[PDB]
Design a protein around this ligand. Structure first.
Ligand SMILES: CC(C)[C@H](NC(=O)[C@@H](NC(=O)[C@H](O)[C@@H](C(=O)O)C(C)C)C(C)C)C(=O)O
Ligand SMILES: CC(C)[C@H](NC(=O)[C@@H](NC(=O)[C@H](O)[C@@H](C(=O)O)C(C)C)C(C)C)C(=O)O
Ligand SMILES: CC(C)[C@H](NC(=O)[C@@H](NC(=O)[C@H](O)[C@@H](C(=O)O)C(C)C)C(C)C)C(=O)O
Ligand SMILES: CC(C)[C@H](NC(=O)[C@@H](NC(=O)[C@H](O)[C@@H](C(=O)O)C(C)C)C(C)C)C(=O)O
Ligand SMILES: [Mg+2]
Ligand SMILES: [Mg+2]
Ligand SMILES: [Mg+2]
Ligand SMILES: [Mg+2]
Lengths: 196, 212, 204, 232, 195, 222, 226, 195, 196
C-alpha cells in the first residue's frame, strides 16, 4: 500500500494506490483506500483493511454525532478521534492512517498516525509498504505552497515510483482534492503513470 | 529439609532439621521448620517456607475462632481439613507445602495428618517429608515400635534427622525436637548437628566410615 | 545438569613468607547425595602441587594426565618440573580441549626450587592463567571463599599462622555450601618440607 | 504488554550550582528509519519544571497530556495556583512515578524513561529519573539510553559527587551538556543533529532553547583512512 | 536396570542386585543376573540403560580375560577398576556414551583384602566400604551408616544387607522382584541361592 | 515480551546487638554494567524506632517500604498512637509480602530495632513473606561473600580455644556497637573488592533506646 | 574490559584496565590484558581471556618463525592478516576482540579486530564493556598530531572512564608505548587509583584455633639412595 | 492412585482397590482405603489425581447423604451413577477438571440385583459385569473374559479376583501393596479383612 | 550501509557511506567500504564486514595470480570470481557486493551480486540497508553517459538521502573514480552533503 497526503496553497490532496494482496495474490486491484469521515475530512488507510475500515466507520460516526451537536469539526479533532481509537487499542490493531482535511480558518492540514497511535502534524505525509522507496524522492521534490497541478504531479510521480518498486502496491492511482471549491476525485491509470 | 513426625504410646514426636539453601549456597542454618499453630497443635515446614508459615499461622487463627464458637478444643481431623480444603482452593496456582499436622486430643488420641499442596490429606503413624526423607525413613522403620518410651522416641527422631543431615546436602544445621502430649506440646531443644554427630558417633559406635 | 556443580567441592591456595599453602574439602557427591568423604582434590608432581575442583571424573583424568606428562618431563629434562613451567603446561593442556573442555577449576601451588620464590596460580576450565600474589579460590563455594580470603588474608604470614588463616577460610566457606565439606585437608609447603593436616569439621 | 514503535533516544541532564540543565534531540525513530525530525521531547510544566522523555513517543504524548491536565486540575479552587500552591518538580515527579509503577504492575507499561528536572520553592535543585518499570533514582548527573553509557562518564568528570555541584557554573554545565550531545551524535545510530536544551535556574528561571545544532565536528581525519588493513 | 548394592566386610565383598527386567508396561523377567565375573576373584555388577549394560559388562569381561591369558596372571581389583573407569571416562565424550553404572567387588590375593569400587557412567571412581547406584543409596545408606563395622563377618554383612533390602521393599514404589546376592572372597566367587 | 522485574544490585546487612541493632547497606544503585547512582539511600527510618531495607528490585523495594511506613501511620490512627513493636511490624510485613504471593515483591527485606525487652532485634524476610528473627543477616548481591565471614567473626564458628585442639569452643562474648561497626565496614570493604555491584558508599543506621543514628563511609567507586 | 589504542606523532600507545570477572564476581583484580605478539607489536585483548592469550601467542609464535625465515622484523599487517584469517576460520567461536598496534619498517599502525574476523583502521579505538565510556573521552579530547605525553594521558583517561563508570572494568591502568626507532616500553600498572584502604581489624588467628585430626609429612623428594 | 477393580456376581458387587499411596520417590502409606460409602447399598471406589480423588468422592457422598435425608429414601445405584456421571461431564469443561475415575458398585433393593458402573473422568459411563480403570484392565480382562459367569457366587468372585491380583503382582512394575476388598449385597457393605 | 556504483562517459564511480554499527552503537564512523581488488577493479561491500572483507581478500589474491599468468583481468572476470565465492558459500555468507571496474576496451562496468550469489550487470547499482529509501530518487535522476561532475553530484545527492533516512548509514561519503586517467579518491563531509 502506498499512500500520501500533501498540503498545497488551495488545500490538501490525498493520494493512494488500489492494490489489496493476500500473500502474492492480488485479491482486489481496484480498492479505494481514500475514505470519507466528513464532508472535507478524509483519510488514507494502511495496514489491516478490516482494522482501518472498522476504525474509519467509528470515526465517521463520532464526527456525524459531533456535527449534530457542535457543528463542523476541525481536522485536528478528527485526527484526535482517530488517535484515541488507535492508541487505546494499539495491542489489537494494525493501522497506519493519514488524516487530511480542509477548514476555511486553518486551510489544508495533514496528520499522520503510525502504528503506535502517535500523532504527527506535517506539511505532507507518506505511508504504507511502498512509501519506503520514495522517502528520498519526496524529500527532494516537495515544496510548500505548490499549485493544484504541481501537487497532482508530485503525488502522481511519487506513487508511480512507489508502485514501480513495491509489489504490495499497484493498479490505479486514486486522488482526492480538498479545497474551498469542494471535493474532487481523480484517477490515473497504469498507461499514464508508468511512462513517467 | 528433613521433617518427621511419628505416633507412639507417649504421644507424638516431631523432629526437623534447620537448613535453607539458595542454589548451592546455604542461606540459613537457623530455620524453624516447626510452626507452633497453638499450644496443642504442631505443623512441619517443607516445600515453601512462606506457604507453610503463613497458612499454618492462619490455621491457628481458624482453630482459635472454632473453640470460641464451639466452646471446645478443635479436633486434629478438623484442623487438618481446614488447611487441606484451603490449599485445595489454590490448587494449580503454585503453592508448595508438605506438612504434618500433629495433635493429641481425648476423642482421637495422638493424631498425625500429612497435608500437601496438591490437596492430599492422609492420616498415619509415621511421616517423613523433604529432600532427606528417605534417610530418615530408614532409621525410623528399623527402630520404630509403639511401646517406645518418651526418652527413646525423642532420641529416635533426633537420630533419624541426623542420618538425613549427614547424607542429604540440603539438610542439616541443627535438629529441633518436640513431644506432643494431650495437655500440649513440649519443646525438647535445639541440637547442633555438628556437635551431635561426633557425640552420636562416639557414644553409638556408628558412622565408622567417617574419621573422627 | 551443570557439570561444575554435580560433584561439588572446593580448593583454596595462599602465599606466605617463604611458603605456600593449599587446601581442599573431601566431599564427593551426586548432587544432593553425599557419596564419599575421602575424595582428595590435591595432588603433587614432585614439589609442585595441583588442586582440582569440578567434575570428579575430569579431576581424576587430569591428575592421571599431569602425572603422565610430568613423569616424561622429568625423564627428558633430568629434573623435576617447576611451578611456573607446570602452570604453562596446565594452561596448554586445557586449551587443547577448547571446544570440549574438562569441567574443572585447577589451582597450582609450590615453591621454585632454584629461586625459593612462593608461587600460586588459578585457571578457568579452558586454561586462562590467574597468577595472584595473595590467594586463589576454586569450586562450588568460590564466592564464599573470596569473601573469607579477602578479609582474613594478610601478606607475609609465617607457615603456622598461614595454616590458621587458610583453614578458617576453607572451613567457614564450606559450611555455607551444601555441596562442600565432609572433611578437609591443608598442605603447608616450605622449600624442603611439606606438612599435611586433616581438619576436624561438621559432617553435614 | 506492547513493543515501542516510534521512539526517542537519550535524554541527558545534570545539576549545577544554581539549578539544573536537561537536553534531548528532536528525533522520533521508527526502528532504523529516522522517520520524524521535529519532535519535542522536553516538556515544561509551569516555570520551574521540565520533564524529559525517551522511549515510545505515543506514550510520551499521553504523558504530555497527563501533565497538561495536572496543571488545569491544580488551578481548580486554588487562589494560590501561581504562588504557594503551584506545582513543584517533586509533585510532578511523584505523580509520574506513581503512574509508571501502577502501569508496570498491571503489565501494561508506558514504554518510557523519564527525567524530571526542576527547581523547588526553596531553591533546591530537583533531578530524578523514572522508567517503564517504576524504578527511580537521583544523582548529580542523569541520562537515559545511550546517554547513560556515553554522556554520564563525561558529565561525571564535571560533577563527580554532591560537593562538586556548588563549584559548577551554568556555563561549564551547559558546555558539558552540549559536548555530550555531540558525542552522542557521533556514536548513537538513532540520534539527530538537532536538539532542545532547557535550563531551570533559581534566579533566572526557565530558559528553553529550541533548534540547537551539534557543531565543531571532527571528520577531517577520515580522508587519511584507507582500506581495512593492507590497502593503499 | 534398578537396584545394585555392595558391601565390603572383613574378608569378603557382597554384591546384591535386583532380578527384575521391566520394559515399560510389563516385567519381562524376574530372575535376571546383573553381574559378570571379570576374573576368578573380581566381580562386576551393573545397572543403567538397556543393551548398553550387558554390552559394556561383556566387553570389560573379554578384555580382562584376554589380559589374564596373555600374562598368565590375575590383575588386582584396583587395576581392573582403573581399566573400567578409563573406559567409561573415554565413553562419556563419545558420539554415543555407555549409560552404565557399575560396582566392582574384588578380593586382592596379594594384599589379602576385599575391595569395593563404585564407578558411575561418567567415570567417577570411588573405593568404599559400602556403595550403591541410582536411588538405592537414598533408602539404604542411613542403615549402613548406623550398623556398618569394618570387622563384620560375611554372615553379619548378609544380615545388614537383608535389612537394606527390606527397607527397599517397604518404601520403593517399584517391585524389583528381590535380589541375587554374590560373595567375593579369597576362595573366589559364589552365589547365595536363598535370599 | 515485557519483563516487569529488574535487578538494581546492592547489598544490605542487619546485625542485632545486646541493646542495639544496626542495619547497613551500600548506596550504589545499578542496572546491568552501568551505575545509576553512587548515592541512592536504601535503608530507611520508618518511625517507632524501626529501620527497614528492601533490597533487590528497587521499584518493589520502594513500594514495600512506602506501604509499611503507611501501615505505621494507620496503626497509630486505629490504635490510639500505640507504638508498633518490632515483632508486630514483622508480622505486618509478612502480610504485605504474602498479599502479593502470586506476583511477588522481588526483594529480600530486613528490618531492625529493639524488642519489647529493649534487646537488639533483626528480622529477615524472603520475597513472599516467610520470616524469622535472627542475630545476623546479609541480603542481596554479596550476601554469600559476607555471611561466612560473619559466621566466623561474630558467632566464632570453627574457632576453638588454643591448647584444647577442638575440644573447647571459643566463647560467644557480647560485641559492642563499635565492634559491630568494624565488622560491618570490613564486610563491605571486602565485598566491594570482589563484587562488581557493591561500592561507592556505605550507609549504616544504628538503633538504640535513644533513637536512630546514621553513619556514612566511602567505598571504592570502580 | 576497557581497552584503547591511540595514535600519536612518532608512534602508537595502547592501554587496558586490569579487572577479570566471572559473572558479578571479580576473579582477578590485576589481570594483564596487554599481549606481546613480537617485540614492537603489542595488542590489547577483550572477550574470552583464554582466547585472547591463546590467539596472540599462536600468531606471535608464527610471526617469530616468519621473522627468522625472512630475516626481517615483523610487520603489524602480517600479525593482522594472520589474526583475522584465523578468527574468521573459527566463525567467532574464538572470542577474541583485539586492538592491534605496533611499529615496523613501514611506520606505526593501529587496528581493531572483531572475533568474527572483521578489521578496522583508526587513529583512536576502544573495545569491551567500557568502550562506550572510553570512546566518549576519546571523542571529546582526541586531536591530530598528539605528542607521546598527550597520547599516554588521553589513553589512560579513556581507561579511567571505563574503570569508574563501567562495572565490567576496574582496578589499574596498564599502558604500552610503541614509538618509531625506539624500544617498546611496557608500563605495567601505570596508574594505581584503587588501592584498598586499611581494614578496621586484624583477622590473624591465635595458633591452635583450628581443630586438627591428623598430621603427616609428605614425601616430595624422589626415591632415596642406600 | 493405581489399581481399582470391580466384579458383579449373582447377588453382589465386589470392589478391589490398591492400598499404596506413592508421592514420587517414597510410598507414604500402605493401608489407604480408596472408597466411600454413598448410601447403605452403594459403594464408590476411585482413582486419579492426588487431592481431587478424595475431594470428589466426599462431595458425591455428601450430596447422596443429603438426598437420603430430604426424601427419606435411598436412590437406586443407576440414579447415583447418573448423578456422578453428570458431575464429571460438567467437570471436564470446567476451568480445572476433576481428574478422577470411579467404579460404583451397588445393590438395587427394588430390583434385587447387583449393579457395577464404570465412569471415567470425562463422564463416560458404562454398566459392566466387571470393570477397571487405568492399566488394571490390560492385565486382568483376559482372565475375567475367560472365567467370568453371571451366576457366580460371592466366594467364586473372590477367587477369580485373587487370580487377577496375582497376575497384577507378577507383571506390573509398581508395588501397589495389595488390595482392600469390599462386598456390596442386599445386607449392605462389608470389608473382607483377609486378602 | 548505503553503497552504489554508477557508470558514466569516462568510466565508473563507486560511492559509499562510512558507518559500521553494532545494534544502535556506531562501532566505526570512518569505515572504508570501497575496496580494491585490482588497479582499476574495485568493489562496494554490504552485509557482514567479516564476510565481505574475507571475500574481497580472496578475490584480490585470485586476480593477482590471474595477472601474473594471463595479464590484466576483465571486470566481468572479477565479478565471476566474486560470484563463485558468494554462490558456492551462500549458506555461510551474508554479502551483497557491487563490483565496479574500468577496462579500455569495455570502459566503465558495474556488476551487482546480491545475497543469493546471482550476478546482474547494470548501468548503475545501489545496495545496503539505506538503498531502499533512494530507489525512487535514483530511478528518476539517473541518465546514461553523464559527465564526471554530474555523476559525483548524482551519487552525492543519492547517498545524502540514504544517510538522512537510514540509521544504519552515516558519517562521510567516500567515492572512488575509475577512468583511463587513473584512480581518484573523493571524500564529502556531513556539513557539505546534509545541506543539499
Ligand atoms: C483483512 C485484511 C487485513 C486482509 N489483508 C490486508 O489487509 C493486506 N494488506 C494490503 O492489502 C495492503 O497492505 C493495505 C495497505 O495498507 C491495503 C489493503 C489497505 C495484508 C497484506 C494481508 C485481506 O483483505 O485479505
Ligand atoms: C528457601 C529459599 C532459599 C528457596 N530455596 C528453597 O526453597 C530450597 N529448599 C530448601 O532449602 C529446603 O529444602 C526447604 C526444605 O523443605 C527449606 C527451605 C524449607 C529449594 C530446594 C529451592 C529459594 O531458593 O528460593
Ligand atoms: C565480549 C566483550 C567484547 C565484552 N565483554 C566484556 O567486556 C566483559 N569483560 C570481560 O569478559 C573481561 O573483563 C575481559 C574483557 O574483555 C577481560 C578478562 C579480558 C564484561 C564483563 C561484560 C562485551 O561483551 O562487549
Ligand atoms: C563483524 C561484522 C559482521 C559486524 N557488523 C556488521 O557487519 C554490521 N553491518 C554494518 O555495519 C553495515 O550494515 C555494513 C553495510 O553493509 C557495513 C559494515 C559494510 C551488521 C549490522 C552486524 C561487526 O563489526 O560488529
Ligand atoms: Mg548434609
Ligand atoms: Mg556443608
Ligand atoms: Mg565493586
Ligand atoms: Mg544517519
Amino acid at each position: 500500500t502506498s499512500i500520501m497526503a500533501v498540503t498545497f496553497k488551495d488545500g490538501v490532496i490525498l493520494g493512494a494506490d488500489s492494490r489489496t494482496t493476500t500473500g502474492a495474490y492480488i485479491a482486489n486491484r481496484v480498492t479505494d483506500k481514500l475514505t470519507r469521515v466528513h464532508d472535507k475530512i478524509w483519510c488514507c488507510r494502511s495496514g489491516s483493511a478490516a482494522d482501518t475500515q472498522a476504525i474509519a466507520d467509528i470515526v465517521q460516526y463520532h464526527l456525524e454525532l459531533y456535527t449534530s451537536q457542535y457543528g463542523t469539526p476541525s481536522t485536528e479533532t478528527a485526527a484526535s478521534v482517530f488517535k484515541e481509537l488507535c492508541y487505546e487499542n494499539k495491542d489489537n490493531l494494525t493501522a497506519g492512517i493519514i488524516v487530511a482535511g480542509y477548514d476555511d480558518k486553518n486551510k489544508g492540514e495533514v496528520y499522520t498516525i503510525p502504528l503506535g497511535g502517535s500523532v504527527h502534524k506535517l506539511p505532507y505525509a507518506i505511508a504504507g509498504s511502498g512509501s519506503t522507496f520514495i522517502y528520498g524522492y519526496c524529500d527532494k521534490n516537495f515544496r510548500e505552497n505548490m499549485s493544484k497541478e504541481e501537487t497532482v504531479d508530485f503525488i502522481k510521480h511519487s506513487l508511480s515510483q512507489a508502485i514501480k518498486w513495491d509489489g504490495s502496491s499497484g493498479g490505479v492511482i486514486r486522488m482526492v482534492v480538498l479545497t474551498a471549491a469542494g471535493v474532487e476525485r481523480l484517477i490515473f491509470y497504469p498507461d499514464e503513470y508508468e511512462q513517467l | 529439609t528433613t521433617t518427621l513426625a511419628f505416633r507412639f504410646q507417649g504421644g507424638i514426636i516431631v523432629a526437623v532439621d534447620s537448613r535453607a539453601t539458595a542454589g548451592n549456597w546455604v542461606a540459613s542454618q537457623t530455620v524453624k521448620k516447626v510452626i507452633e499453630i497453638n499450644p496443642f497443635l504442631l505443623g512441619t515446614m517443607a516445600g515453601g517456607a512462606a506457604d507453610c508459615q503463613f497458612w499454618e499461622t492462619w490455621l491457628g487463627s481458624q482453630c482459635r475462632l472454632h473453640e470460641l464458637r464451639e466452646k471446645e478444643r478443635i479436633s486434629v481431623a478438623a484442623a487438618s481439613k481446614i488447611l487441606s480444603n484451603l490449599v485445595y482452593q489454590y490448587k494449580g496456582a503454585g503453592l508448595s507445602m508438605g506438612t504434618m499436622i500433629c495433635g493429641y486430643t481425648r476423642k482421637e488420641g495422638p493424631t498425625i495428618y500429612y497435608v500437601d499442596s496438591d490437596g492430599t490429606r492422609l492420616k498415619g503413624d509415621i511421616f517423613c517429608v523433604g529432600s532427606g526423607q528417605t534417610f530418615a525413613y530408614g532409621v525410623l522403620d528399623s527402630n520404630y515400635k509403639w511401646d517406645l518410651s518418651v526418652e527413646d522416641a525423642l532420641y529416635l527422631g533426633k537420630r533419624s534427622i541426623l542420618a538425613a543431615a549427614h547424607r542429604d546436602a540440603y539438610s542439616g544445621g541443627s535438629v529441633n525436637l518436640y513431644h506432643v502430649t494431650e495437655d500440649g506440646w513440649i519443646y525438647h531443644g535445639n541440637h547442633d548437628v555438628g556437635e551431635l554427630f561426633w557425640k552420636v558417633k562416639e557414644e553409638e559406635g556408628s558412622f565408622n566410615n567417617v574419621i573422627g | 545438569s551443570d557439570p561444575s556443580s554435580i560433584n561439588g567441592g572446593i580448593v583454596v591456595a595462599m602465599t606466605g613468607k617463604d611458603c605456600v599453602a593449599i587446601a581442599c574439602d573431601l566431599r564427593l557427591g551426586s548432587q544432593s547425595l553425599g557419596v564419599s568423604n575421602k575424595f582428595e582434590k590435591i595432588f603433587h608432581y614432585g614439589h609442585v602441587f595441583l588442586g582440582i575442583t569440578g567434575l570428579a571424573t575430569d579431576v581424576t583424568t587430569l591428575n592421571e594426565m599431569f602425572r603422565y606428562k610430568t613423569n616424561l618431563y622429568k625423564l627428558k629434562e633430568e629434573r623435576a618440573i617447576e611451578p611456573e613451567t607446570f602452570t604453562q603446561l596446565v594452561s596448554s593442556s586445557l586449551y587443547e580441549r577448547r571446544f570440549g573442555p574438562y569441567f574443572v577449576g585447577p589451582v597450582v601451588a609450590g615453591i621454585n626450587s632454584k629461586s625459593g620464590k612462593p608461587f600460586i596460580a588459578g585457571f578457568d576450565l579452558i586454561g586462562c592463567i590467574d597468577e595472584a600474589k595473595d590467594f586463589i579460590v576454586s569450586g562450588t563455594a568460590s564466592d564464599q571463599l573470596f569473601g573469607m580470603c579477602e578479609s582474613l588474608y594478610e601478606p607475609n604470614l609465617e607457615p603456622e599462622d598461614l595454616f590458621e588463616t587458610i583453614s578458617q577460610a576453607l572451613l567457614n566457606a564450606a559450611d555455607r555450601d551444601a555441596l562442600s565439606g565432609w572433611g578437609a585437608v591443608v598442605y603447608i609447603i616450605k622449600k624442603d618440607e611439606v606438612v599435611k593436616r586433616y581438619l576436624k569439621m561438621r559432617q553435614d | 504488554t506492547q513493543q515501542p514503535i516510534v521512539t526517542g533516544t537519550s535524554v541527558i541532564s545534570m545539576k549545577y550550582d544554581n539549578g539544573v540543565i536537561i537536553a534531548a534531540d528532536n528525533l522520533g525513530s521508527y526502528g532504523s528509519l529516522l522517520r520524524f525530525n521535529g519532535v519535542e521531547r522536553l516538556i515544561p510544566v509551569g516555570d520551574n519544571t521540565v520533564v524529559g522523555i525517551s522511549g515510545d513517543i505515543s506514550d510520551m504524548q499521553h504523558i504530555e497530556r497527563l501533565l497538561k491536565d495536572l496543571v488545569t486540575e491544580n488551578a481548580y479552587d486554588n487562589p494560590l495556583a501561581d504562588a504557594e500552591e503551584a506545582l513543584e518538580p517533586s509533585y510532578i515527579f511523584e505523580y509520574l512515578a506513581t503512574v509508571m509503577y501502577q502501569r508496570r504492575s498491571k503489565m501494561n507499561p508506558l514504554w518510557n524513561a523519564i527525567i524530571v528536572a526542576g527547581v523547588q520553592s526553596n531553591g533546591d535543585q530537583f533531578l530524578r529519573y523514572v522508567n517503564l518499570l517504576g524504578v527511580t533514582y537521583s544523582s548529580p548527573t542523569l541520562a537515559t539510553g545511550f546517554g547513560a553509557h556515553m554522556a554520564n562518564p563525561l558529565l561525571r568528570k564535571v560533577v563527580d559527587r554532591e560537593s562538586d555541584i556548588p563549584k559548577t557554573t551554568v556555563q561549564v554545565a551547559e558546555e558539558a551538556i552540549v559536548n555530550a550531545m555531540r558525542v552522542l551524535y557521533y556514536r548513537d545510530a538513532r540520534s539527530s543533529r538537532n536538539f532542545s536544551l532547557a535550563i531551570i535556574d533559581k534566579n533566572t528561571g526557565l530558559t528553553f532553547k529550541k533548534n540547537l545544532q551539534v557543531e565543531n565536528m571532527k571528520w577531517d581525519f577520515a580522508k587519511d583512512i584507507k582500506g581495512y588493513g593492507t590497502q593503499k | 536396570m534398578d537396584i545394585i548394592l555392595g558391601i565390603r566386610v572383613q574378608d569378603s565383598v557382597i554384591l546384591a542386585s535386583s532380578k527384575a527386567v521391566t520394559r515399560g508396561i510389563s516385567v519381562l523377567k524376574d530372575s535376571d543376573d546383573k553381574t559378570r565375573q571379570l576374573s576368578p576373584h573380581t566381580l562386576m555388577s551393573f545397572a543403567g540403560e538397556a543393551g548398553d549394560t550387558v554390552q559394556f559388562a561383556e566387553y570389560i569381561q573379554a578384555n580382562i580375560q584376554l589380559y589374564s591369558i596373555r600374562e598368565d596372571y590375575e590383575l588386582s581389583p584396583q587395576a581392573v577398576s582403573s581399566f573400567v573407569r578409563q573406559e567409561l571416562a573415554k565413553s562419556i565424550r563419545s558420539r554415543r556414551p555407555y549409560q552404565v553404572n557399575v560396582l566392582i567387588g574384588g578380593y586382592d590375593k596379594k594384599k589379602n583384602k576385599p575391595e569395593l569400587y563404585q564407578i558411575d557412567y561418567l567415570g567417577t571412581k570411588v573405593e568404599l566400604p559400602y556403595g550403591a547406584h541410582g536411588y538405592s543409596g537414598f533408602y539404604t545408606f542411613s542403615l549402613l551408616d548406623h550398623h556398618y563395622r569394618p570387622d563384620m563377618t560375611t554372615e553379619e554383612g548378609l544380615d545388614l544387607l537383608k535389612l537394606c533390602v527390606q527397607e527397599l521393599e517397604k518404601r520403593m514404589p517399584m517391585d524389583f522382584k528381590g535380589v541375587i546376592v554374590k560373595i567375593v572372597d579369597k576362595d573366589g566367587i559364589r552365589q547365595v541361592d536363598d535370599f | 515480551q515485557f519483563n516487569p522485574y529488574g535487578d538494581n544490585g546492592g547489598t544490605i546487612l542487619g546485625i542485632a546487638g545486646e541493646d542495639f541493632a544496626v542495619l547497613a547497606g551500600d548506596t550504589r544503585n545499578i542496572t546491568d554494567y552501568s551505575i545509576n547512582s553512587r548515592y541512592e539511600p536504601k535503608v530507611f527510618d520508618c518511625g517507632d524506632n524501626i529501620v527497614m531495607s528492601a533490597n533487590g528490585f528497587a521499584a518493589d523495594g520502594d513500594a514495600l517500604v512506602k506501604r509499611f511506613k503507611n501501615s505505621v501511620k494507620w496503626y497509630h490512627f486505629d490504635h490510639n498512637d500505640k507504638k508498633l513493636s518490632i515483632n508486630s511490624a514483622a508480622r505486618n510485613i509478612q502480610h504485605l509480602l504474602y498479599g502479593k504471593r502470586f506476583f511477588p515483591y522481588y526483594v529480600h527485606t530486613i528490618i531492625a530495632g529493639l524488642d519489647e525487652d529493649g534487646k537488639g532485634a533483626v528480622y529477615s524476610f524472603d520475597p513472599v513473606g516467610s520470616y524469622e528473627r535472627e542475630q545476623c543477616r546479609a541480603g542481596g548481591a554479596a550476601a554469600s561473600l559476607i555471611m561466612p565471614f560473619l559466621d566466623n567473626q561474630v558467632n566464632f564458628k570453627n574457632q576453638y580455644e588454643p591448647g584444647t585442639n577442638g575440644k573447647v569452643k571459643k566463647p560467644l562474648k557480647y560485641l559492642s556497637v563499635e565492634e559491630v561497626i568494624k565488622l560491618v565496614r570490613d564486610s563491605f570493604t571486602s565485598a566491594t573488592e570482589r563484587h562488581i555491584q557493591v561500592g561507592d558508599g556505605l550507609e549504616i543506621l544504628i538503633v538504640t533506646k535513644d533513637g536512630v543514628r546514621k553513619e556514612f563511609y566511602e567505598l571504592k567507586r570502580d | 574490559t576497557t581497552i584503547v589504542g591511540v595514535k600519536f606523532n612518532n608512534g602508537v600507545v595502547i592501554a587496558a584496565d586490569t579487572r577479570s570477572t566471572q559473572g558479578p564476581i571479580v576473579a582477578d583484580k590485576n589481570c594483564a590484558k596487554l599481549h606481546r605478539i613480537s617485540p614492537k607489536i603489542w595488542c590489547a585483548g577483550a572477550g574470552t581471556a583464554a582466547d585472547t592469550e591463546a590467539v596472540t601467542q599462536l600468531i606471535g609464535s608464527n610471526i617469530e618463525l616468519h621473522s627468522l625465515y625472512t630475516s626481517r622484523e615483523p610487520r603489524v599487517v602480517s600479525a593482522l592478516q594472520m589474526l583475522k584469517q584465523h578468527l574468521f576460520k573459527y566463525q567467532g567461536h574464538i572470542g577474541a576482540y583485539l586492538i592491534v598496534a605496533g611499529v615496523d619498517p613501514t611506520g606505526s599502525h593501529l587496528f581493531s579486530i572483531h572475533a568474527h574476523g572483521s578489521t578496522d583502521v583508526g587513529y583512536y579505538l576502544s573495545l569491551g564493556s567500557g568502550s562506550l565510556a572510553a570512546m566518549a573521552v576519546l571523542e571529546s579530547h582526541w586531536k591530530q598530531d598528539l605528542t607521546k605525553e598527550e597520547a599516554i594521558k588521553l589513553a589512560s583517561d579513556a581507561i579511567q572512564a571505563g574503570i569508574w563508570n563501567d562495572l565490567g572494568s576496574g582496578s589499574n591502568v596498564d599502558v604500552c608505548v610503541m614509538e618509531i626507532g625506539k624500544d617498546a616500553e611496557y608500563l605495567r600498572n601505570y596508574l594505581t587509583p584503587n588501592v584498598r584502604e586499611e581494614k578496621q581489624k586484624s583477622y590473624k588467628f591465635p595458633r591452635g584455633t583450628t581443630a586438627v585430626l591428623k598430621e603427616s609429612i609428605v614425601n616430595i623428594c624422589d626415591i632415596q639412595e642406600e
